[PDB]
Structure 1
Amino acid sequence: MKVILLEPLENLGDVGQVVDVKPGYARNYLLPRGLAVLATESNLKALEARIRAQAKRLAERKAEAERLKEILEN
Structure 2
Amino acid sequence: MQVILLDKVANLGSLGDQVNVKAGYARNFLVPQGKAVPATKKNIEFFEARRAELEAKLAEVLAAANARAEKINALETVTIASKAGDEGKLFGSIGTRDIADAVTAAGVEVAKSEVRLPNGVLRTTGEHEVSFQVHSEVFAKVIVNVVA
TM-score interval, smaller chain: 0.5 to 0.7
Report the TM-score when normalising by structure 2. Answer: 0.33
Larger radius of gyration: 2
Match of 2:11 in 1: 11
Residues 7-56 of structure 1 deviation map (CA, whole Å, 9 limit, x = unaligned):
101010011111110111000000000011100011011132236xx6xx
- Structure possessing the higher relative contact order (Cα contacts under 8 Å, 6 or more residues apart): 1
Q: For structure 2, which runs of at least 5 residues remain unmatched after alignment?
A: 53-148
Report the TM-score when normalising by structure 1. Answer: 0.64
1:38-49 matches, within 5 Å, as: 38-49=38-49
Q: For structure 1, which runs of at least 5 residues remain unmatched after alignment?
A: 55-74
Distance 2:7 2:47 in 1: 14
After superposition, the CA RMSD in angstroms is 1.4
**Count of residues in correspondence between the two structures:** 52
Specify which structure has the higher proportion of strand.
2
Output the amino acid matched with 1:8. K
Task: Give SS of 1:32's match.
Answer: helix
